[PDB]
Amino acid sequence: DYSRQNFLDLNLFRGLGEDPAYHPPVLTDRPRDWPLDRWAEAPRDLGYSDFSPYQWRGLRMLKDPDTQAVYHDMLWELRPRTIVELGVYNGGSLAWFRDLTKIMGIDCQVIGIDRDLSRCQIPASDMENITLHQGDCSDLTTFEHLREMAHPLIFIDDAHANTFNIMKWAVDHLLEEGDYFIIEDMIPYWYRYAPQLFSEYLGAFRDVLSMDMLYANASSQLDRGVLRRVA
Amino acid sequence: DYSRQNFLDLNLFRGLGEDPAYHPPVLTDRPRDWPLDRWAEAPRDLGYSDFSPYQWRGLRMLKDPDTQAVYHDMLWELRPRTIVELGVYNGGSLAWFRDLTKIMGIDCQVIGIDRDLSRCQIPASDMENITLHQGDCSDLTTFEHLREMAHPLIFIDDAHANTFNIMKWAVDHLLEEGDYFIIEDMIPYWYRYAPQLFSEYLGAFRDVLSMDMLYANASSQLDRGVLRRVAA
Amino acid sequence: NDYSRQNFLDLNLFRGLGEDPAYHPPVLTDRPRDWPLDRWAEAPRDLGYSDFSPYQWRGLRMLKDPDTQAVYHDMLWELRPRTIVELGVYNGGSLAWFRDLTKIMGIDCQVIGIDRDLSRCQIPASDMENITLHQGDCSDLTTFEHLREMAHPLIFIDDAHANTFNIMKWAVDHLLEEGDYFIIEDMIPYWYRYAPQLFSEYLGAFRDVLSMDMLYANASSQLDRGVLRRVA
Amino acid sequence: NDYSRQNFLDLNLFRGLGEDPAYHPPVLTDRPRDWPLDRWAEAPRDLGYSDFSPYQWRGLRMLKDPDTQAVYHDMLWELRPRTIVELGVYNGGSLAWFRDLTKIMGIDCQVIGIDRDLSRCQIPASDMENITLHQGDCSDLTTFEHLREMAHPLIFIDDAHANTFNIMKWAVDHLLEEGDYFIIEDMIPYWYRYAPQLFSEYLGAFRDVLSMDMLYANASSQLDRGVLRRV
Amino acid sequence: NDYSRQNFLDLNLFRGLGEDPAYHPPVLTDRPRDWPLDRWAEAPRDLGYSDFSPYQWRGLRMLKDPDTQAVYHDMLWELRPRTIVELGVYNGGSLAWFRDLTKIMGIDCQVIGIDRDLSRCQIPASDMENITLHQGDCSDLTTFEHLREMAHPLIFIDDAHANTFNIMKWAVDHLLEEGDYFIIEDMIPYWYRYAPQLFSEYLGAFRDVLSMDMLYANASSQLDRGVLRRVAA
Amino acid sequence: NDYSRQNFLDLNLFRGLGEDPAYHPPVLTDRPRDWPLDRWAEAPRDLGYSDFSPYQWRGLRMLKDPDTQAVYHDMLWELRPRTIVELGVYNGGSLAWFRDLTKIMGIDCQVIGIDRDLSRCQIPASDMENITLHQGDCSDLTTFEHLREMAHPLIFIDDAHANTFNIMKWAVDHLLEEGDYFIIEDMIPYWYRYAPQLFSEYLGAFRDVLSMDMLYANASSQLDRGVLRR
Ligand SMILES: C[S@+](CC[C@H](N)C(=O)[O-])C[C@H]1O[C@@H](n2cnc3c(N)ncnc32)[C@H](O)[C@@H]1O
Ligand SMILES: C[S@+](CC[C@H](N)C(=O)[O-])C[C@H]1O[C@@H](n2cnc3c(N)ncnc32)[C@H](O)[C@@H]1O
Ligand SMILES: C[S@@+](CC[C@H](N)C(=O)[O-])C[C@H]1O[C@@H](n2cnc3c(N)ncnc32)[C@H](O)[C@@H]1O
Ligand SMILES: C[S@@+](CC[C@H](N)C(=O)[O-])C[C@H]1O[C@@H](n2cnc3c(N)ncnc32)[C@H](O)[C@@H]1O
Ligand SMILES: C[S@@+](CC[C@H](N)C(=O)[O-])C[C@H]1O[C@@H](n2cnc3c(N)ncnc32)[C@H](O)[C@@H]1O
Ligand SMILES: [Mg+2]
Ligand SMILES: [Mg+2]
Ligand SMILES: [Mg+2]
Ligand SMILES: [Mg+2]
Ligand SMILES: [Mg+2]
Ligand SMILES: [Mg+2]
């Protein structure tokens, strides 16, 4: 088996999964319809190992429900005119953000940037108020090609490359008082691995960004990574 | 002062709160804008009560995030034409179910039943495809006066009163194959307090209802309480 | 279809009580009672039965768990109350226990029980020395005004959880003297969770007449932050 | 340099017991006993003093914590013992408790306590009805030989924790009848930890005479897997 | 302000490593080192510094924490390896430790560190007895082809986590004899989380050659379900 | 009936030691050593043997667990002790470890083990280099008065736990120099719990001569709040 098979690097699926396309979970060790006469003997665990088993309208979502409630609250209060997502994957959170603002009556343009848009599962007929843009975050030439968009604005780092140089770029070019810059996932790990540089780098933005303590502790993905532009 | 006062029974607010109207959390022991030069010294706890801090479009929502996820998947799968909810309170979940079905392209009437609609706060401008009904759940006539409903259907007990007689009524007079009958919150408590009677009660429905294992363990509010109608 | 051959009680009747007020010794199911000592190490480690309210006193169900009993023992040994009033009797377990404890300690104490329904009380007719029963609703302050004078010190215990703050106001003005207790069992953590603004205002109204007794207030989950006494 | 003046007692003398046999009511160290109700939400939530062995019965210390008390209540109510031998006494709170408890149940029970040292016993002489104290060492089997006229049923409790297994032999042969209990408090878990193969061998020797009562044997951490009775 | 003047490193450069491969003792910031004994009760109970990776060996940082050292000690003692390979070297603390432990145990064992970048290695040149350094990328199997043929038993440790299953395939067919270990540190729990189906199949293709050693595989959180060896069933 | 004939040892003899001073590797009972990889996810995740005191060094049982070994490694690295006294020797595992660790650090350290009973000790004579054993009860001070003069710096470790505070007094008055350590293992949490009042007084009697070293005192559950110096 091993000799007649070339192996993929499982690092490619880091925090993403094996398949960008959504598939409902399969139960492997119980029936789906458990009989009520044996109700007490039914197993109490989830029944499936699916990595991040969350979806919006048939599209995988890497934002888990607690993260979703924070963004709900944030969209409701800010009524953002632009949401930029750095890192697209399957585009599920793109479609989620456009749909949420649509239901809230907020006229919001959702912009998604990725190096690799081939994984995006959103059909063409469902792309109203959603623009894609191919390009690396490993270089800032990607971001300069932006038709100057409306405010308020939420800028979400979901690609985790060159992040502080991008935050610098965002303060110098794009962000206005009240706008958010959000770093998903990485902050607690960066403080863990490099406390001193992290403390200094974040501290270099003391006069331009603050940490929003309404939302910063409300989800584990956004944990201490919700920042906004101060006056 | 206590001599002046006359004190309300706080049990009125059990599992609810004191104001059906939503208000953003209020920070008590910290500023909203933490300085980044002191990022490491910032308090790590939530900063407010975790009781029921959720909302949908300015309306309080007593369905927490993991519950919302189960209901999204369920709505996406079943594509229900009618959702009935016992217990309306502020209307948050009614507006949410209506909204979620609408953005999915599903034609879904949402129906709310409650003995007290005076706390519902969904503006009429936002009430499309929602029908409220006043009536006590303890009285079966509340349900006998309901009109024909389209299927598939999801019937959700959130009032917690007279539940097993209501489930009996729904099986004989409403639920068709594939429909859900969900009991929110109550099942772990009833089983803890009255395990033998609960088991016997639930097992009495063994030929008509099954526990849906895809959803029954995925949220603590819905825990062991997601049921659906099986073939006759 | 057993459900159609049955009527269903509201399982809310058994909230935090259980199905049967009579005590029955717990019974093992998935193991023999006598485990052979050659297989000692393979014996299951779990309780073997439900840990919901399994406590008793001389064949009467007792809804006070051991840590609560420890608190009341200490409190009785310090205060030596002449009177113990218990709102909410259920099956009489804590009544007989309060009378028995005070008798062992050489304390001449009258125990009084107040309940809307004394039909579940299982105390033998022969074991009612220094115990008095009153049928009445806590929702009417009449129940308490008609009570005849009682000796002090005195411990008043809310275990019925209805009209609690109006009763506390009544008890401060017309019953409690310096050093007497008013104890709200179980309920205080829940009211603070569900109604923090009103709960803090209501408790604050009593700031000049009652204080939290920190020696007992944190020593049991049932009495958690619920032990108060009269000031001069 | 105060260390040079003193002779230091061996703190191992106080192992699992405390400094003083006499009961001393807990002292709140960092709070007032009366907490103002207008600042109710600010009050500390922890116990407020050491939870080591703060339990008592009628002004005497009790080294049996409440969960153990409840087990022994259930066992006394079921068995209705005419005799309760306590090996190891200390202050005598357990003696007075067992005697008081049997007495309110209408059980006519004699309570016998054995100990090498009865000077720590604090039961007043007036309050010694149906209690008998005996001064011997547990290691030496002659202590037990010197009386055995006891009515049944009978509960035998080891709190001395010395020469326990030889004592259990003498018990099965020269004392216990069908239904009588033999209880090893506290030590069983620890002896399985340090000497599993030996403990298993020693215990397994009693397979034909004694069994583990599974109704009571997991109901309290002090009694954990130490409640045995004759079959 | 200060951010305007700065150019920021990608903090992923330090993922699981730290900012400095050189060892620096922890230092206290919020208490005195010498706590007075008359106030012993009041002294804080927490560690007093970051527990990320504070471990060392003879002045060199060690990314293998104590419970993992205890497992490798047992395994060295039982197996008595003549060769220990270490994919990914970093500062060389583990290399110096493996060589020292085998030396103290009386085992004649060569230690071979492989890595794309050996500049971070802090082992003094005067203390490199029975240690060999090869510089090459792990993604490319050219790095292992030119390796001299080593004595067995052998322990092969993946601490670089790149192209890991192609290297495991190559190890089985070109290097691993019966009894030898192939240890994947850190990654297995994470790979099963993100890619449960693809991971279970890949591992399972080695069911005829490799097995999981249950004496060591649950004995440390870094080695968690990743101690394999060329042994049957 | 196997019980009627047997004469049972006191199991308290094994309190905190175990039944055998010699090292025997852990053994699997409820599973195979080689789990098949096609059932990898099915394999049990628990350790599979008793976690009591499974540790060793060179075929010798070691009652110092891994977290305690890291603390002592750091302490040796920083202080560079010329002498290490261990009260309580048992199998001699900690002693051989201490000698080995000092030697590989290039430190010239004599290790001195004291114990009432040296019969359990199992170091081969071949590996006894730089280890001096002494027989004596800790329960009486004569054991320490017969000790010869020792090189500094020095680490005095108590693992016997008898007569400890008197021995600490002796050590301050007759042995310890500035910078030297006196470490009480295992016992300090327990003595505070059972006798907080006398323990506080006793430890506080030493306030002018010893201090709790906070860099090491909270780093191990065996050394927890018992790492002292000066
Ligand atoms: C899947 S996450 C995006 C999260 C997504 N918006 C969501 O929450 O559903 C990471 C994505 O960022 C992309 N990415 C990683 N590094 C990048 C880089 N250097 N430049 C552009 N995109 C990158 C990956 O292709 C991947 O699709
Ligand atoms: C807050 S929950 C409703 C949950 C709501 N759907 C949500 O998630 O936002 C409880 C509601 O049930 C109602 N209720 C309680 N008992 C009832 C009864 N017997 N009949 C009808 N409604 C009842 C209460 O008035 C209250 O509004
Ligand atoms: C928890 S039981 C009492 C516990 C009992 N004191 C003990 O410790 O074992 C609650 C009792 O309160 C009674 N009860 C509930 N509401 C009441 C009310 N409004 N007035 C009087 N009794 C009430 C119920 O009938 C029930 O017997
Ligand atoms: C744990 S205390 C007894 C506590 C009390 N019986 C209870 O359960 O609440 C242990 C007692 O056993 C006694 N003891 C300890 N070793 C003994 C021995 N070898 N022989 C006789 N008595 C002993 C001690 O004097 C001490 O008072
Ligand atoms: C976890 S550290 C090595 C652990 C070290 N042997 C120890 O335990 O003390 C990871 C090392 O692997 C190296 N590395 C990362 N990716 C690599 C690759 N693709 N090829 C070769 N080495 C790589 C890094 O440069 C780094 O030095
Ligand atoms: Mg992300
Ligand atoms: Mg509810
Ligand atoms: Mg209660
Ligand atoms: Mg004891
Ligand atoms: Mg690693
Ligand atoms: Mg030790």
Side-chain angles (χ1 to χ4, degrees), chain A residues 121-193:
Chain A
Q121 301 288 299
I122 304 168
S125 60
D126 188 39
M127 281 297 291
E128 228 217 352
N129 302 265
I130 306 179
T131 308
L132 276 22
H133 280 134
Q134 214 154 61
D136 227 301
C137 316
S138 192
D139 75 311
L140 291 356
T141 210
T142 293
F143 307 98
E144 281 270 30
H145 308 342
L146 252 52
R147 296 162 34 111
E148 230 40 55
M149 58 239 93
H151 296 76
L153 190 145
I154 299 167
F155 193 99
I156 299 165
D157 181 42
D158 256 312
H160 317 132
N162 197 206
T163 294
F164 283 90
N165 279 331
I166 293 171
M167 202 166 78
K168 173 189 198 187
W169 178 91
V171 169
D172 285 346
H173 292 101
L174 188 62
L175 301 176
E176 276 169 25
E177 145 159 50
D179 293 350
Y180 282 79
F181 190 98
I182 309 207
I183 294 174
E184 310 196 338
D185 303 298
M186 303 304 278
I187 293 285
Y189 297 100
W190 285 339
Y191 181 53
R192 181 151 190 73
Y193 299 136

Side-chain angles (χ1 to χ4, degrees), chain D residues 147-158:
Chain D
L147 188 87
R148 81 222 184 244
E149 265 120 276
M150 306 173 199
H152 300 258
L154 190 141
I155 301 158
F156 189 104
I157 304 150
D158 174 62

Side-chain angles (χ1 to χ4, degrees), chain D residues 151-168:
Chain D
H152 300 258
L154 190 141
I155 301 158
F156 189 104
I157 304 150
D158 174 62
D159 273 289
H161 308 317
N163 193 35
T164 277
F165 269 95
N166 263 84
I167 287 164
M168 199 154 83

Side-chain angles (χ1 to χ4, degrees), chain E residues 16-17 61-64 86-95 114-117 120 136-139 159-162 185-186:
Chain E
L17 303 186
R61 296 193 54 208
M62 263 262 273
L63 302 151
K64 296 191 199 320
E86 255 278 48
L87 263 182
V89 167
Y90 194 51
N91 78 303
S94 55
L95 270 17
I114 296 153
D115 199 3
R116 63 158 151 198
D117 167 35
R120 282 108 106 246
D137 195 33
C138 300
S139 264
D159 264 300
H161 319 306
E185 300 193 358
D186 303 298

Side-chain angles (χ1 to χ4, degrees), chain D residues 7-219:
Chain D
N7 173 94
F8 297 93
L9 309 169
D10 198 334
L11 272 22
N12 285 160
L13 291 176
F14 309 125
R15 229 274 187 326
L17 299 163
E19 288 177 58
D20 199 338
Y23 172 65
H24 286 145
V27 189
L28 268 2
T29 47
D30 65 2
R31 74 209 53 190
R33 187 172 176 182
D34 297 308
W35 196 272
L37 253 35
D38 59 303
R39 270 136 197 60
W40 175 90
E42 304 190 339
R45 315 245 279 98
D46 66 318
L47 190 41
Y49 53 79
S50 177
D51 77 352
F52 158 49
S53 174
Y55 303 110
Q56 55 120 7
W57 188 254
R58 313 234 288 115
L60 303 167
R61 298 192 57 212
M62 271 255 289
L63 304 215
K64 300 204 193 302
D65 69 38
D67 294 306
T68 298
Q69 282 170 43
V71 168
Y72 272 127
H73 176 292
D74 286 348
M75 182 189 304
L76 264 37
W77 183 255
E78 191 193 29
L79 221 210
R80 289 186 77 82
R82 288 268 282 284
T83 311
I84 293 160
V85 181
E86 255 290 5
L87 196 47
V89 180
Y90 197 49
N91 68 313
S94 79
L95 266 44
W97 177 72
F98 272 128
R99 187 272 325 269
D100 283 343
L101 224 74
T102 48
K103 219 250 285 268
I104 33 229
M105 292 179 172
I107 300 156
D108 178 23
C109 195
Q110 283 303 316
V111 172
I112 306 148
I114 296 149
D115 210 320
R116 84 200 143 189
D117 190 20
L118 303 165
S119 56
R120 292 127 131 215
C121 193
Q122 301 240 328
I123 296 162
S126 71
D127 201 19
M128 208 74 101
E129 220 281 305
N130 285 197
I131 291 160
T132 298
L133 273 28
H134 273 149
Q135 199 146 43
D137 207 81
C138 297
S139 289
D140 195 64
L141 285 206
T142 323
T143 293
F144 312 102
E145 245 151 302
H146 267 110
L147 188 87
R148 81 222 184 244
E149 265 120 276
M150 306 173 199
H152 300 258
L154 190 141
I155 301 158
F156 189 104
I157 304 150
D158 174 62
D159 273 289
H161 308 317
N163 193 35
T164 277
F165 269 95
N166 263 84
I167 287 164
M168 199 154 83
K169 198 229 76 130
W170 170 94
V172 174
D173 293 354
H174 298 316
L175 199 75
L176 311 175
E177 297 187 334
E178 237 224 289
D180 292 358
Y181 280 77
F182 188 102
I183 311 200
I184 298 178
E185 293 195 350
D186 295 293
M187 304 307 295
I188 292 254
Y190 294 107
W191 286 340
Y192 182 55
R193 201 174 164 68
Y194 304 143
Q197 94 96 336
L198 207 76
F199 178 85
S200 292
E201 180 168 35
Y202 283 14
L203 227 213
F206 297 86
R207 64 193 197 91
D208 298 331
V209 293
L210 289 169
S211 72
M212 176 156 63
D213 193 333
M214 297 307 295
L215 199 62
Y216 298 137
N218 301 318

Side-chain angles (χ1 to χ4, degrees), chain A residues 1-10 13, chain E residues 139 141 163-167 169-170 198 201-202 205-206:
Chain A
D1 304 291
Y2 68 96
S3 223
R4 41 250 24 188
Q5 156 142 58
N6 188 301
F7 302 91
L8 296 183
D9 193 346
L10 271 13
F13 313 129
Chain E
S139 264
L141 286 75
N163 186 229
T164 291
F165 277 102
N166 287 350
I167 287 161
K169 167 258 166 271
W170 173 94
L198 256 134
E201 156 186 328
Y202 280 16
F206 297 81

Side-chain angles (χ1 to χ4, degrees), chain F residues 111-174:
Chain F
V111 179
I112 294 168
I114 291 164
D115 207 296
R116 67 171 161 211
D117 176 22
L118 294 169
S119 78
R120 261 105 104 269
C121 189
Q122 309 228 317
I123 307 158
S126 23
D127 315 325
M128 275 304 291
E129 185 195 19
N130 270 68
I131 296 167
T132 308
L133 268 44
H134 283 112
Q135 200 146 224
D137 216 330
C138 290
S139 214
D140 94 89
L141 292 182
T142 302
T143 302
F144 308 90
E145 287 162 349
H146 302 159
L147 289 180
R148 302 282 199 282
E149 89 167 300
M150 303 186 215
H152 301 261
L154 180 146
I155 301 168
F156 191 104
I157 303 172
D158 178 44
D159 252 298
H161 318 297
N163 198 23
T164 307
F165 278 100
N166 270 163
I167 291 155
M168 207 164 68
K169 159 167 137 118
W170 171 86
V172 169
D173 280 352
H174 298 287

